[model samples]
Target: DDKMNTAIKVIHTLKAAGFEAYIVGGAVRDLLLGKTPHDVDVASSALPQQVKVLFDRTVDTGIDHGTVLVLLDGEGIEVTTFRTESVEFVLSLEEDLRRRDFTINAMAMTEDLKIIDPFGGKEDLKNKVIRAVGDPDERFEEDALRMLRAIRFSGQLDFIIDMKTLLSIRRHARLIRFIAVERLKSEIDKIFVNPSMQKSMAYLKDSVLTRFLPVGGLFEVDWITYHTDGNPTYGWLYLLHQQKRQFTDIKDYRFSNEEKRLIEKSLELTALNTWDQWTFYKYTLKQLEMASRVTGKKKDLAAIKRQLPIQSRSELAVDGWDLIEWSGAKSGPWLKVWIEKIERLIVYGILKNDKELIKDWFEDEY
Candidate 1:
């Protein structure tokens, strides 16, 4: 309700300036579904500059497409100028809705909550169907990302895609290759993590989209089951392991450095015969937890953590300076090796961490 009111204020401002505006796109669809939209966007007949002039704080987020972000009450309400198939600003709301990807996203609502669904969006919503607004081929040609979005929405809302729309996607599945890898990664990641992802699996597999992806035979391999608590990083590792592919192979997909590190560490843990003190000390708790999931086991993390003598080598009582002074030798690679030995011995409980004990043990061991 709060978001709706702020969005209504944006509508009033545009209307007072003698322009037509309505809450449009996914916001309207979510509202109709009785769900709170992540954000509210309004489509208006006003030009981007005209919309900007009426607002105190505005951003040209999509200025090329006549979309201006109106900042009000700490909320951002996107206001886009109505557009036609020609990709230019038009006065007709129906034409703007016609350009939308799916009927569910092609509806508009006035400030008074009156719906203007020119594309049977309400009927599709009631039927739980995701259908293209016009010809599916024309829509897919306009933007290939919509094909992925259709499946993504089906997974998100547990809806079914219209047969014609699904067929169109299969015919144009190759177009997915033309999309930016980052966009493809985002949609695939969403599918992997969604609890209802299984609902979209048949379409993804049969539509033959995975053939063009970095990985193939998606569900053909025994990957982890669809779970509400699934993680995309784990999914990537599972798929990569099944295909015998390296993380570098998906470099174009682009994961954050932290995520890459996590995957690398998880992959390393999977190769282990058994985890010991050194394993716990070498890998972080999060890495261990992630590896445990990929391996299909729920380890007693608290027990493992409690048994670990030291979480890191920094906790070792002796340092390179201490070792150098004790050995009367130059600080070099051997010194690091000796320190690691001491860290290992201490972690394994074979040597005491006391300073004098470490010095005596070092002398005896060396």
Candidate 2:
């Protein structure tokens, strides 16, 4: 509600100031598709400072790039002034639009909801084609990250890349190495979760996007064939794990312990069906739900859902004190062993919250 009000106020202010303003970019594109736009971005001829002055709560998020973030009732709306950048291949707005990776996103809108498309973005959008805005080679040269973004967008939107753009990407696929891996990973992850991941992945292979990544072997048809019976979420996890493993040996690669844990856990869960219940319990229910989304599992999540009520170590009635008192265990390796024993019993539903049962079991087992 705040975003909507702020967008209206900004557009009103720009129009009153004798300048045209409209909500543009992905918001406009989503709006045109009859979908609710998540973020509202206003574009106008008004300068960034001018917008800041008009709005009481404004931040110069990217003032040098002609962008101001207006805060209204705790919501932020990025308002970029209407200006164009030029690259060696394209000129003015046409070049700017063309430089964008996908044609579906290249369309612009006006204050009156009028679309300003210098490229055939509207037509391409209608056809569900991820066409390039201009000379594909020149556009790609300006920003190589667009190559991955193209496939990522295709996966997200279930659109097919235009043949010309596809060919151009393959021709200049080697340029993808110039892009930062972090930036590349973001797009790849989005593609991994996309409903049309297989189609998008096919595009990645054809465009040679994987050649620049560490785990290029996952792109092979043989790998895909082997995993055809596996869950898509698991496949995505496995593929990412493989990629991460390859890069883990590199001195320059920086992966946090948490990230390493997630990768390792994902691989472990994918490798065995025995730990499915334990995995779902240890991880949040939401993450387990999302696992099938990424893995494309044939079986519904019911298999995992049925095991939700089972207890794990966290839910065990006994604690380290109980282990010490009953098992005569010290606070060292024996404590860990007792905890694992309790965890195994709880997971298998052999024990509940009965303290006597836990104490007796510990005394007998130890």
Candidate 3:
């Protein structure tokens, strides 16, 4: 019925099939931390093909990486086999957990709710610290993305990175060049909107890891140390506008085209010092209010938004056909001009949004 139940059900199924499986990764860490996990990932001794045959409704979601998806009760549970350097038939969970980035996320839980932490992940979690499982350099060398993931974990959780892990990150900081820009952007996006990064900023800056990011210079911005209920784009906009860079510069990061438009629109909302009706029409009233709220302005944004004459152009009452049919005007190149004038009139409350009144107004104005 829920994520936890689904996870337990999955572990039970695997165990019943004579294989070892348990709830692992962030799920185990969250349970120990007294937080509900965003998702539960199951690790198993069963290979991907074996796991697939166990469930009737299964998908080779990540078969290449030894992961299979069991679809049960309308929920997808990720079941992954252990990873090992050896070509051996079986590997210990320790070998599997060893490849993980941090100890806090490398623990596991059996179906009976037994913890299997070969590493001291439970203790590291209890102490609120982020440490690599083994040699941090070895882990980073295997996957450079782990470096960014380490910073992201520090920024997401309030945990401080272990000194050795921090040092390892500095040594391989440039190795982030091997990672794709989009994957790296995903990490920074998570860090940008959270408050945890502020607590770990000193170490992050000193590490000089930002050299690989689109604007590693972004780390240098004097950002506020607390999280806000604002779009991540707003956080980036603040940094860029502070440095007077163009919005186009974000093309280097993971911002999608639509997200870019939203950020640009948000910037436009804050750009207008006076939140008037024209500002309301130019920018969506919601953006204006949020932009206003983010600025800590005490203005009654509700009243300002309520007063905008036409929320959308559909409410303008007059269409292209209506103008032509009434005013004997041929619909062609100038139809856009007529429509724009009608919307402007209605939005500004210069004319009422009635079909007859709009037609009469157009005749009188023309």
Candidate 4:
């Protein structure tokens, strides 16, 4: 049943305007699966402008695509018009549901919790499969990104794509090149965080889809173990391990500068021959956690955790001015060097993190 107060009120308001609106798409499937849904997506019989008029607060991105973010209870619920050129609102719901990528995802729910199962979406959900709503080829032609999404749901939901839908993906996999890299990266991040990742990737073995993707040698991978966490850098690193060609950097994929740094540093840290406390302390937390998760050998995690006397450099009791004053060192490269030296001494437990002790030690050492 549609029970959320604000979301239901959105439905009620749309219906009061003489337009049909219902809880639709992934939210319905997730609700049926007994999982707590993250978003409440409602498809309305009203246009974006009409829906905008109904809400006081909304985002600008919603305007162009017949989608509006109705901010309620400090959380936004996406209310999108049943995408239509001409508003035969009744036909809009039917046509919009039909245009969905998967049968399991096409189901909608009414205000009173009535199920709209025009495409046997209920059956697909019951049977635990992802089948195309109509012709798989035609659907992929509509949006080739669905091919990866088909594989992604296999891992994400632990459901297999119907054979025909899968075959169409193999045939049309190249069309994925048309999709934006960020969109593709976003989906794969969702895919590999689950334990069923290999299930999704297994299908790629016999297909050329990897050639069109940013990640190469995906089909030939022998994943030692899987990580069940967010941060797709681990997934990208896994592909690089299996990749035969020389890739100096993973610039093939587009990601944030921070993300790129994490992955690159992971590769650099893993290459180090030593696994000392300094090594662990030097690398980022994600690199340390993911290294064990990806390789399945948790070496020195607790030891490295407890190895340092202090967690951060700021914990060192001495300020840079203290070092400068004590050692009569000019404010130059020596400040950085003296700071590093003090931090190393404190981190290694050789010196107590007391400002006076640090200044005295610095005076003696210099």
Candidate 5:
């Protein structure tokens, strides 16, 4: 509500200056759906310089792209010049909306809340379909990333792609390779959390976009379903498990080092049939819980802790110093081995972590 009110203020500001402006793109679609758009963008006929002069606080987000962030009422609203690379600072709202990727995202709304849907975007929304703005081939050739956006949008809204657009996507799926890997990967990351993941997976195959993806073994994963709910780690754990892909297999996907470690540890636990006390202690609660989801083994961090006699090596009653004094042996690599053995014994319930008892056991063993 605040975003809309602020966005409308921007529209009024531009219109007051004898320039046409309105809320545009995704914000319009989301508003029509009764959803609060996270951010609002305004499309105006005013040039970038004119917009800067109109707003008290203006930030040049991308001057080259004719966008300026107008800070109004403690919130920033993005205002951009209408689209048309050939024409300088010229284009009607209808003409600019025409170049959008999808009909649903191609509409604009006036400050008075009058929706200007020239391409049946409203009817398509009511019908629950994803159709290209004008010509699917021409649209995809202009930017191949729209093909992925079509599938992702369908997955997000539980809508189906129009037949003509779907067919064109299949025909132009090869052009997906021409897209930058960073952009492609970013889109795939969204797919990983799609509420209708299986549906998206089906589109990936039907449209043949899977062939151009950077990762291998997507088909093998379609059968098994796991709900990640926007958690990329959980999504990758499921995918890597099905593909039997190691950490190196997804290097090009550009996961953070922390995520890579989590994936690596989760995979290691996935390969195990059962976990011992030592196993539970070796891995953190996060790793164990993530692994349990992949393995279909219910694990409670508290329950796992209850099974261990000592939570950590530092909790062990006997230290290397205690072992050294009892064995009369100088500290060396042998001390590490003896201390680890004692740690294992304590955690496994073979020995109580008492200084005197451990001392007696060490003397008897030596």
Candidate 6:
């Protein structure tokens, strides 16, 4: 009933039928490291169609690509048919493994726990280094996205990229434009939030990954050193905003309105000399929280929480109906104005939920 157990069973069934089966990719690497793997993929010498015949709940998720998704206990596990190389590009399996972005991810394991080190991946993992399996240029040419994956793995594993791999990335950094913006954005967000982010961003800059993209010169050595203190989350939003502005011509650049607003407010809070209660109230607590997260000011959250509880407008006990009755205004725009005025007073800490105060203000103002 356990997920791993189910995966083992699938591998066993395939091998019992004379097919060679192994747990491949990140799962095997993570298992060796004693970390919990997120997904378990099985690689076998059997053809995709043959694997489908062995499993009743199998779906041809990528039959053309020699991959099948098998459903076991309602959980989908990807089982890929063993092939030497991609169809369009003719390369052997050993070459394919070597073409992988990092040595740590190049190893494979059989169902019987036989470690396959055709690419020196086991040693790379032990050393906590992200080295390209073989010639980095040839590997990157096979798939440009591998560049981003290299940075992502470095962040995830807290390892430094090998010198040769780093050089190769800088050489082919412009190829990142061939990859999808959404994918790149996702990776950028992960890097920003990663505990090892500062180092990761530095590597990204040195490798020139930011050069091909529209993220501006914020990743330059001088800017990175000045803002990040050599850490990723530090001044992350400010840097991102600057990049966003530089690339406004690229409509597909990764930024939502809400994200832009948060960045703007973060800049405002840092640069402004004053913080009026009205300005504070204009931005809701939720907006403030978002801004705090982007700015990496976790301590500000506590202050916001403490101030929120006693904030006048938030604790106000007046309703629209009360305003209508006290001001003798119809259920129209005039009632709306009275409510706004009362809210302003409450936010300024000038009035409480006192009905007399509400009535007096309504009568005098109207």
Best by TM-score: 1
> Model 5, residue 91: displacement in angstroms?
3.7
In candidate 1, stretches whose alpha carbon ends up further than 4 angstroms from where it belongs are 84-87, 222-224, 228-230, 241-245
lDDT scores for all predictions?
Answer: 0.83, 0.67, 0.78, 0.76, 0.84, 0.70
In model 6, where do residues sit more than 4 Å from their true spots?
1-4, 47-66, 71-76, 83-99, 221-235, 238-252, 256-258, 275-338, 354-357
In model 2, what are the clashing residue pairs, if there are any? 231-295, 232-294, 232-295, 232-296, 233-294, 233-295, 233-296, 234-295
Ordering by TM-score: 1, 3, 5, 4, 6, 2
lDDT of 5 at 142: 85
- What lDDT is reached at residue 153 by model 1? 90
lDDT of 5 by residue, 1-366 (tens): 588899888898899999999899889888788788988999999989999999899999677888899988989899999975434455677778888899988888887889999999999988889999899899999889999989899888889999999999999998987778878777777887777878888888888888777763454475455877467678878877877878787787788889888999989988988788888888888888888887677667658766788788778887788777888888888988888888888988999899998888888887
lDDT of 3 by residue, 319-346 (tens): 8898788778677978889888888777
For model 3 the TM-score comes to 0.89
Q: Report clash pairs, candidate 4.
A: none
lDDT of 3 at 329: 65
Q: What is the TM-score of each candidate against the true structure?
A: 0.92, 0.73, 0.89, 0.84, 0.85, 0.76
Q: How well is each residue in 263-295 modelled by candidate 2, as lDDT tens digits? A: 456555555555455666676544454344435
Candidate 3 ranges with C-alpha deviation above 4 Å: 84-90, 325-332
**True-vs-predicted CA distance for residue 307, candidate 3, Å:** 3.4
